[PDB]
């Protein structure tokens, strides 16, 4: 593969006396005794040497040059692995891969060692590292922060069918790639009251927790730039810890230093859900507060504190200063940055508002809501009371705008307070966003419109340049280059490798739908995929499936709004059709189902136990043979998405039309190779408009259609009424035919789809088995399945984060992109 | 055009001199006196002239080389006009055109002066005629044999939006066509009884009629080829009728004549729907007697009567007689060549049978029931007592067979029996037929098999070898090369002339769909078309309508089945859209309806005023000004076919699944470059399976969806009480607002529909208009509708009827087809 750069001679044995070097001095080991894990330490403390030098020009360009930077404040950073994308982006994989070799070493078995940085839940927290990938392939001073949690999202098991929670300790033979910076770590204040003196507002008797920020180098492709992600690590006040005169024992007062340590302790692990717990409130104002404190200090030191003429001021710091939050969870940096402003730099509140406006702006990533945050008053009152008072004082302020702008209106101003009321008083953080933004932005153009019709159609009257549309993106290296060499190499071949960091060039592809070499290179490299999947799957969990059939392949965070229960449901009727006609052709197929449930989702763990409860009667049936495989894949995570979908032949994004607000994933399966069938919800409408209708297969409800049910009112037993082969499955899994042990197991899974579906399973059935019947006709056609595939790759190209980040640059942070390769090679001489 | 053929400068003058030569000595007149008609009369006849060499030396060649014969009885034979027909296939086109030019006269305009030969009501009238030209084009021995009625189908004229008949005296000025042949005169026996005598049966008593015969020449594709279509004429007994010694005077009596030549006077206006009139009855009988008396003594002839050595026998008869009977309509012909075969022919009923069932074959064209054939046995039992009498005997021997097949069944004897009993007994003509026959063909794959699951099941499970399919077909020649020869100019262009007598080569065309100079042809030449037909209707009805517009045209017999009333809701639903939304940019559209509906068929005459009444509001809307034009096409005949089809770029072909047979005007339309929306029925299926499902636009329900529909119940009111538009337009009609001075004048449409819909029309509406939505959205980009237009009439080729010919004559017939070219150039020496 030529995308992996050269393997020079020279490149090569530095990189074999260093790989050594390392091995003898910084693993204390030698080729006798050395592990696989310290090779593979060894291997990824080589790699890394190379990026010091670009690492420290970058920071020093942006120090000299003083650009805007941008600061992309979120509570996740979906991140993976870190070994293969570093070396893809500085072009070392062939020389490494080489040196390897030579070393007596399979560099892939070494990085199948190193652990997921898995520090997300799914998408937005995936949408921040593609987002920090192409930030720096764009020569952005951009700047990633967030919490550097001790255990990010739990693995997964799967005993006796169920889900089972593990403790994801990732930094358990620690970490090559981050570095410490003692030297900026910041107190966090909790707690406390606040008193009112003379000229101002003190924020006093507080609690005080520090926060030690971790660097993680940030590599763009191939131009030399290495951006910053800083992660703070929460540790014991060294001073008034066990300084608080407690005659609780000295023992037990060193060993509660615990406490205060416990708030980047662990990813909260719910996908799109709100909990109001506290310590997740007090993991989101640790974030906000050291942040900002970095973000002021490195604004003041453009020697703006030798701001002699005119005074000292903040004016510019909207000019050097964009701080985007990824959905409401740093939103307290609204209020903290005002609390700042005012209490401690003294600036009059409407110049500190003026400011934090033009500074801020906030990213929607779905509207169902269940997931909108809703702090109680009395949670923020009692830990952040200072930010609550500025939280009543900008919603008064708010509210009068809103007053003169619209006379009369009550019910607005009921409806667009930030404080919600009711038994139980909360803040409505979207609304604290909105308020506090310049820009209020959507994932995707229909997710977008939804806002300004629906949710923030309030704030869409009172602003409408406020929002925004920013459809998601993907980043082409780790989602092309890196998981999938084949199909990169075969596109270089015939386009060049511009692509890589220019993927509307994918186009050109188009001339190669006729081209009866590419036809059959782009189905020999997911044949080949296919083949490298299975074999993953039987040694790593010893599952075995058919490498000829259809991989039909549903991937992500277990949700209702989801439907894998559709999914389920088309799975049993394929196996109700088959047993009802055994003799009768069929596609054969391989449905494999992953994604991980939020622990105590109740639902969520049942429908993985009814995927992994239908494998076990469809998979030992001996009439099914081989033409049918249903397989739960366990601990889906970033790593296991780069294996398993550049191997899937179709892509199933069957949610609910109006749900998903944009998906990101089913970007992922377009660049791939693989074809999509799924509603017209959230990106999959662009992804559609993109490829063409022809090439896709779309099916169910639209968005109005499901407003129109609702407004008659959904009801599941008339779909059950007159649909036969639905009443056959409900029947199956009522009678217990899924459960022999346990009749009534699934029994929660009827009621909720006969009487309580938000998301109508059953109104969306019959239009997708049809629509599946469909799927399999063109992949009985070989030749016409690839053709199709062909149409897709060469349109995914408006689906790559850089474009994203383009227009977040332009449109929403004001700062102009780039693709000049930094000098920065290293420093050697 | 070069598909026109040659105007050498000899055959030229030589066209010129014999032109004159009919106007002088022919017409006897002068180029100062001659009228119009006179014009294309000399041309005719000196077109006509070409025709009677080949026309003898095919007659002589079948008598000399004996082949089998093949007769094909129909009370129908839809022939529009023949002189363009006679001149294509003959290849005197542009010497014909170069000739009248020279002459001063305007071909085109001569042509137009011609009466079509409108003897049919729609489908199977015109497969009859079809089917003649593709079996001389074929090199078969076959003979065309029905009836010369005075009056065709009646000229339908729109007189205050409603339909008015006229009736259709195309004879009125001659036909330079046919030629009497008074010598083939045969009587035709009605009435009388029938007695019993020592060896045998007798009828007498009878009244008689006689039957004179008319040729017509049906000329092959350029093969030298001129069968032969004899229709017979009635003419009241030169014996008996006046020396009946009758004393209601002598003038009376001659006057009376009448009576018995009425069999012969107008075909009767009911498509697929069954009356029973004994004049119809008539002339059903009238075609079967005459013919089969010619057929035998045609074999005969062979000097089958010089069988000495054995003795003279009809043994042979089925291996030199094929009898097709186009539907259940000439049926008699079963009890005719017993009753011929056992009272004349003295043969044992048992060998007589056996003939009977080897010579017949019957084709179905439709399974709806209001369609079929059931005449009282009272009346079969007063006109024609020996035939009802043999019925019996027949439906005796067949039950018996039913009997010892299926013992103890005793239901399956009452619904296979011949004779149906009730209030009023009558005798199942198709029952009839398939017991007389060894062949039954549906007209269409779907077709085919609905009659052996349904209606025909148990004759099918009786004699499954019995059934058989012979999907329709369409001539190429009339259907392309005649109607749009700028087509067919462009096609020969780049694959040859080949195709016109072998459309599979059509597909050569697939090499096409991106070659530039092709798109833009194939564009302008409808264009060109769409220009033309544009002109027709300024001229010809002072209409005028936007030749830039998508033309969304519907021709066929006004039914009930063929949703002409789903049609007129999507159209109102356009204007809705567009009154809704005046600024909303729509594609231009001008909606074609055109069709004759039966007289005393209430329904269908209503559908035509509501079409009008559409008319009336919508085309003088100044909001909707030329965006949207609602048309009824007057007088819907094939010349107008001829013209219509060539410009249309929709086709609607939206019959209830199930309901059309076949179809062959949607193979039209195919054919000449228009797409297609329509259900999936009839040929539908199969078009859509030729060219592929993404270059259609199919829609609604299916036939099982139709069936399950039916087996809940179907409910009109639900699709209205949950779809607004649909409720919008119903009662814009119930209101009155389409007919302001007669508010109440469409309540029995709108009854209908809410209440008595048998046909589903408000079931199939929101899947028809989205699908017409998806028809814009192509018709928006001209050229993906192009390259989409290229992959139909690339893959038309198994719509032509000399396929379904080939498989007649293969399959059913016996016989083995041709195109070898006869000899027979014409006797000048
Ligand atoms: C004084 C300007 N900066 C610069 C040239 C840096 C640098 O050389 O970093 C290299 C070791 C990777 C960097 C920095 C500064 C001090 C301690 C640790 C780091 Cl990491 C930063 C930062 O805030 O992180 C800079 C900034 O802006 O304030
Ligand atoms: C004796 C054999 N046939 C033959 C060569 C024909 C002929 O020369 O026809 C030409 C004038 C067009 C033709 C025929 C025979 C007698 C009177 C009129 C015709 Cl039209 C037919 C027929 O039944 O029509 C023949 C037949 O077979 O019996
Ligand atoms: C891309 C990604 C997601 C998001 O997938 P969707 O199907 O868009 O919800 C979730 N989890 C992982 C591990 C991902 O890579
Ligand atoms: C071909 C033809 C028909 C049959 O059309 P369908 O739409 O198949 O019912 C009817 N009338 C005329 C004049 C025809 O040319």
Redesign the interface.
Known sequence: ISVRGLAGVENVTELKKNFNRHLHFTLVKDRNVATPRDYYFALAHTVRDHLVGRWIRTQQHYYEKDPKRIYYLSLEFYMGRTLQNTMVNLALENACDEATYQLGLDMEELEEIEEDAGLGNGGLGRLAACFLDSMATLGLAAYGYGIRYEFGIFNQKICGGWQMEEADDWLRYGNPWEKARPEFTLPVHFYGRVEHTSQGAKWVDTQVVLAMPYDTPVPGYRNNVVNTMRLWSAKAPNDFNLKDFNVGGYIQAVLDRNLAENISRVLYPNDNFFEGKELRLKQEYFVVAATLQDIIRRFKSSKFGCRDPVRTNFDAFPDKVAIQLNDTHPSLAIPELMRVLVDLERLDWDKAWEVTVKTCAYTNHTVLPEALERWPVHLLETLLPRHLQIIYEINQRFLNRVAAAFPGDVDRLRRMSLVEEGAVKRINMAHLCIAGSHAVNGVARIHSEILKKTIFKDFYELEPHKFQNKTNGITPRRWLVLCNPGLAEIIAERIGEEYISDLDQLRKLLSYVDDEAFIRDVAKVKQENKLKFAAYLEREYKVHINPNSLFDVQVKRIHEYKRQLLNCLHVITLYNRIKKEPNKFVVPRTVMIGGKAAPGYHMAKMIIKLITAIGDVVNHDPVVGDRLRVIFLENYRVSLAEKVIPAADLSEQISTAGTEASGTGNMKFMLNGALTIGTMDGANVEMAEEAGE?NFFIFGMRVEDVD?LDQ?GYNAQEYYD?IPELRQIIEQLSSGFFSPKQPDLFKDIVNMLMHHDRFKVFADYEEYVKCQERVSALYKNPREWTRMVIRNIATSGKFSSDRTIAQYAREIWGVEPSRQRLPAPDEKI
Chains 1, 2 share one sequence.
């Open positions: 022809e129109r008659r007159r």
